[PDB]
């Protein structure tokens, strides 16, 4: 009862409620899906409708040429953390004149996200991220959570009702590596479709698809550019 008001107070069970309530905010967010093949990594996100007349959102942000992210959580805390990612990637190309490895960028996020958790008067970052990037080791799906720990995923979906998508991804997770660029995106579309009510369907307006690859930099596709990908769904 009194253990949940502060992030520095351990519970009698050896548990921090304030961090777990932050991981509740990312499950109250919007469903986003991402997955990788042996070639390309793709992010597919539902742009959520706050009303009928409102252009939904932009849930996929550019970090660097080889890196892009998807947002589930508090949006202003996402770009606050994304501005750090953009500055960290520009720091490497400035100093080292090389693209910063996706595996090392996520290690910098886990170190920055933890500091608010252990100190009094500060709150954990309430946004989860699906980071898709192409390094010299291939595509990377690395996930971040309000808890500073991160996970390297083959395919992952976060946001509201993302468990229905994780059920779909866990079934087909064996054939993802052999997929081509066009067929790979269609798996993320079907996975993200299971996150919608029976009265809703995937359209061109509410769907944004990020794609990163070897000879292809990270590019976001708007409502007009997602039509060729939705033609097979």
């Amino acid at each position: 009862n009194q253990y949940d008001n502060d992030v520095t107070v351990w519970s009698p069970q050896g548990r921090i409620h304030q961090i777990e309530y932050a991981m509740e905010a990312v499950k109250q967010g919007s469903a986003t899906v991402g997955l990788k093949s042996k070639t390309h990594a793709v992010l597919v996100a539902l742009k959520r409708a706050q009303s009928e007349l409102a252009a939904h959102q932009k849930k996929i942000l550019h970090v660097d040429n080889h890196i892009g992210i998807s947002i589930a959580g508090l949006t202003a805390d996402a770009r606050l953390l994304c501005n750090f990612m953009r500055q960290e990637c520009l720091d490497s190309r400035f100093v080292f004149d090389r693209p910063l490895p996706v595996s090392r960028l996520v290690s910098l996020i886990g170190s920055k996200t933890q500091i608010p958790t252990q100190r009094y008067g500060r709150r954990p970052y309430g946004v989860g991220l699906l980071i898709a990037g192409y390094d010299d080791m291939g595509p990377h799906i690395f996930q971040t959570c309000p808890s500073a720990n991160y996970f390297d995923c083959r395919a992952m979906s976060i946001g509201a009702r993302s468990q229905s998508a994780r059920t779909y991804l866990e079934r087909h997770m064996s054939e993802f590596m052999e997929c081509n660029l066009n067929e790979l995106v269609k798996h993320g579309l079907r996975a993200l479709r299971e996150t919608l009510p029976a009265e809703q369907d995937l359209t061109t307006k509410n769907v944004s698809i990020g794609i990163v690859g070897k000879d292809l930099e990270f590019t976001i596709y708007d409502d007009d550019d997602v039509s060729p990908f939705l033609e097979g769904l």
Binding site: Q18, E24, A25, V26, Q28, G121
Partner: peptide, 14 residues
């Protein structure tokens, strides 16, 4: 009773 940075049981940040 509590600070300005807190998450609700639903994560609403009161």
């Amino acid at each position: 009773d509590r600070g300005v940075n807190t998450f609700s049981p639903e994560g609403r940040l009161f």
